[PDB]
């Protein structure tokens, strides 16, 4: 009558076998809705910051990929002004065994290693390709401004 065994499986593994540097709690009203907090990756311009992300497991999931979006403003070539994430295991390369924790550390991996060269990148991309040094400092600036509380 409830959720597919798989969802229960993962959901329980999360609130049990936590991903390092990533917090993932269930919403108080939607069992397919999760409030995630990702710690800025070590050695990244986001290090020291905490970023809020929301994750939703669609009905037709695992078929359809989970929906994820940043809720904390971040300066990154693959995260837009509304927090939408350009990660391909989220659109093209998605398939059933990936689960949630593949997406999560992958997202953390994106922060650790930006992809300015991505076709659908930002505009932040432009500044990351041409003046990476300045882009990295601005990402740190935005971390100080939006991800320290």
């Amino acid at each position: 009558a409830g959720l597919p065994r798989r969802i229960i499986k993962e959901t329980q593994r999360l609130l049990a076998e936590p991903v390092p540097g990533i917090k993932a709690e269930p919403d108080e009203s939607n069992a397919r809705y999760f409030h995630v907090v990702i710690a800025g990756p070590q050695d990244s311009p986001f290090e020291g910051g905490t970023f809020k992300l929301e994750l939703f497991l669609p009905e037709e999931y695992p078929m359809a990929a989970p929906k994820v979006r940043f809720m904390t403003k971040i300066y990154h070539p693959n995260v837009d002004k509304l927090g939408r994430i350009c990660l391909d295991i989220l659109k093209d390369k998605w398939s059933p065994a990936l689960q949630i924790r593949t997406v999560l550390l992958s997202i953390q991996a994106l922060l650790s290693a930006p992809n300015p060269d991505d076709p659908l990148a930002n505009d932040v991309a432009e500044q990351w390709k041409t003046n990476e040094a300045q882009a990295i400092e601005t990402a740190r600036a935005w971390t100080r401004l939006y991800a320290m509380n």
């Binding site: 939607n30 397919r32 929301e54 939703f56 929906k67 979006r69 509304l82 939408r84």
Partner: peptide, 15 residues
């Protein structure tokens, strides 16, 4: 009975 959270519904409406 899956419900779509406000933020994701609005993302849909944005698109």
């Amino acid at each position: 009975g899956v419900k779509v959270p406000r933020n994701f519904r609005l993302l849909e409406e944005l698109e």
